[PDB]
Amino acid sequence: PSLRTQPSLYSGPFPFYRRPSELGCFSLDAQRQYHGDARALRYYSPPPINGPGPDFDLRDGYPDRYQPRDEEVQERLDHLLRWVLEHRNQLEGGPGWLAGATVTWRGHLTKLLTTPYERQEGWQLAASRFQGTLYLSEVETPAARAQRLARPPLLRELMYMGYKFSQYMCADKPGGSPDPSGEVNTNVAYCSVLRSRLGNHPLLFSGQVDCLNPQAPCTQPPSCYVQLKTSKEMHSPGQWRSFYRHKLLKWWAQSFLPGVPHVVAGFRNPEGFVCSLKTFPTMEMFENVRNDREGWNPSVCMNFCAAFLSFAQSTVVQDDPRLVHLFSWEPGGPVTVSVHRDAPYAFLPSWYVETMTQ
Ligand SMILES: CC(C)(COP(=O)(O)OP(=O)(O)OC[C@H]1O[C@@H](n2cnc3c(N)ncnc32)[C@H](O)[C@@H]1OP(=O)(O)O)[C@@H](O)C(=O)NCCC(=O)NCCS
Numbered sequence: 001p002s003l004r005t006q007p008s009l010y011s012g013p014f015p016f017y018r019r020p021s022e023l024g025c026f027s028l029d030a031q032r033q034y035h036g037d038a039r040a041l042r043y044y045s046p047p048p049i050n051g052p053g054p055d056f057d058l059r060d061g062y063p064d065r066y067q068p069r070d071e072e073v074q075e076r077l078d079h080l081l082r083w084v085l086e087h088r089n090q091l092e093g094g095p096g097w098l099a100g101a102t103v104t105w106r107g108h109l110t111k112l113l114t115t116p117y118e119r120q121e122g123w124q125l126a127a128s129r130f131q132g133t134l135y136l137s138e139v140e141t142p143a144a145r146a147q148r149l150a151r152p153p154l155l156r157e158l159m160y161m162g163y164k165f166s167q168y169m170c171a172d173k174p175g176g177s178p179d180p181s182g183e184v185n186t187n188v189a190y191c192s193v194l195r196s197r198l199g200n201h202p203l204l205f206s207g208q209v210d211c212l213n214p215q216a217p218c219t220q221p222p223s224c225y226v227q228l229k230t231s232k233e234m235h236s237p238g239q240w241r242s243f244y245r246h247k248l249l250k251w252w253a254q255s256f257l258p259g260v261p262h263v264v265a266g267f268r269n270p271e272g273f274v275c276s277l278k279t280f281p282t283m284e285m286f287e288n289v290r291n292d293r294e295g296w297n298p299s300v301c302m303n304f305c306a307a308f309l310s311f312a313q314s315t316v317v318q319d320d321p322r323l324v325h326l327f328s329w330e331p332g333g334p335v336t337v338s339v340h341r342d343a344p345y346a347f348l349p350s351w352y353v354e355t356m357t358q
Pocket of ligand 1: 069110191206
């Protein structure tokens with residue numbers, strides 16, 4: 001019992017995807033402490049209209065003003081589960097809504113979306129059903145762990161430059177000014193919690209959001225949010241083509257799911273400076289590959305994701321927070337399933353299970 005991932009199997013009409021609604025939010029602070037409020041939310045603040053063009057030094061402060069998170073801490077769903085626990089009696093959708101939902105991180109859904117096109121990076125998703133609700137929690141594969149531990153210095157600095165770009169583009173207050181003189185602390189995060197539905201699969205998920213744009217067309221979340229990215233400056237049509245085919249797919253999937261309608265890219269030169277900014281509206285990203293023989297197709301992404309959710313729901317029959325069905329996938333193969341109990345794979349903590357049980 002496995003699930004094939006070839007795009008041709010999923011090339012039908014675009015499935016139903018509910019306009020996402022923000023149910024709430026939470027923040028993680030510089031010490032990675034949870035707070036049930038928007039204190040981590042920053043505000044889109046691009047270069048002044050009359051000033052010079054961007055020249056953001058993304059290397060500035062690396063590494064002496066860099067406070068990296070501890071990647072050996074496995075948080076799994078814990079922060080989202082705290083939000084759910086604290087809001088379980090205030091969820092919309094009527095009685096039993098949560099029991100019919102699938103609960104996960106936005107990025108887990110992103111990896112499902114891009115699976116039909118992914119050629120390098122496999123994944124593992126642990127699944128447990130508990131009080132009807134299906135929970136999906138990513139497991140770091142042994143190969144991803146090894147590449148994390150052997151991360152080249154170049155790639156470590158590139159992760160910093162991404163975070164640093166937000167420091168140049170966002171302010172602590174609406175209409176305020178950025179202040180890049182501080183530290184880059186990757187514990188800090190603002191997370192939007194969303195309701196959606198894909199096909200007949202209700203979803204509750206959360207995703208980190210870079211900033212709110214007081215100038216957005218719509219002021220209500222998630223339509224007012226902006227996702228920030230960096231990418232190498234491109235100079236040839238072939239370079240742009242490769243960017244549309246590979247990078248844009250991931251940018252699209254990540255922001256389509258939570259309803260974030262704009263991705264703003266800082267293009268960086270080889271010396272590490274952002275010299276150019278470009279806005280990519282999420283619902284226009286596919287236009288760049290719509291007539292491309294080697295392009296991606298959002299219908300394939302969403303139809304595979306729906307097929308996986310159906311596959312996971314029908315595979316995880318037993319309601320048991322200590323039981324895990326592990327869905328494993330590597331490029332060139334189907335999604336396969338193995339069954340595990342308790343540690344290490346079981347991921348729903350007793351502080352969640354016990355409260356929900358009572
Ligand atoms: C809080 C969190 C869980 C929210 O999840 P999410 O929104 O679903 O995560 P996404 O994968 O979509 O990533 C969104 C952002 O989180 C941040 N982030 C994600 N993984 C990160 C890491 N390993 N280190 C630092 N920051 C990270 C980045 O700012 C990223 O933005 P980008 O896509 O522009 O790079 C996520 O930010 C996070 O911390 N993920 C780390 C998970 C992890 O390390 N798992 C272990 C391997 S399985």
